[PDB]
């Protein structure tokens, strides 16, 4: 607690802040176009966004 040093780190530039949109993977995500998904989850939601396969 005690707000002065509670969240005192800069959660900014760098991978301490870039979270996955789905359920917060912080290892190897995609900042492109505002997808902001974990790459493990991009095959779960490939057909649903509009990122269909190689054609």
């Amino acid at each position: 607690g005690h707000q002065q040093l509670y969240w005192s780190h800069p959660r900014k530039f760098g991978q301490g802040s870039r979270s996955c949109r789905v359920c917060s993977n912080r290892h190897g995500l995609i900042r492109k176009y505002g997808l902001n998904m974990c790459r493990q989850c991009f095959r779960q939601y490939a057909k649903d966004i509009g990122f269909i396969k190689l054609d």
């Binding site: 979270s19 949109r21 917060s24």
Partner: protein, 98 residues
């Protein structure tokens, strides 16, 4: 949790007049966007609706990452009695559309 009593009224007054609210599972997030006026933080919105599940009053699931909420039948009548409200002030789940 802390339960500041003028601020539980702040979160109960909207969770009663509509049966929905949209907290997002990140606790170090400074401001709740839907209330936005009575300087309440994201954390108690979990830690008061934890208390509304565990009595048996509200019911929730889990989104991708957000929380949703739906009132039970027991949760409806208890909260108007909690806020000193009659059985004419009603939640928005009975009938609001035409």
């Amino acid at each position: 949790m802390l339960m500041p009593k003028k601020n539980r009224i702040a979160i109960y007054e909207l969770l009663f007049k509509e049966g929905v609210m949209v907290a997002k599972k990140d606790v170090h997030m400074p401001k709740h966007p839907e209330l936005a006026d009575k300087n309440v933080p994201n954390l108690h919105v979990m830690k008061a609706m934890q208390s509304l599940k565990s009595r048996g009053y509200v019911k929730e699931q889990f989104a991708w990452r957000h929380f949703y909420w739906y009132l039970t039948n027991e949760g409806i009548q208890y909260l108007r009695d909690y806020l000193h409200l009659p059985p004419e002030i009603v939640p928005a789940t009975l009938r609001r559309s035409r």
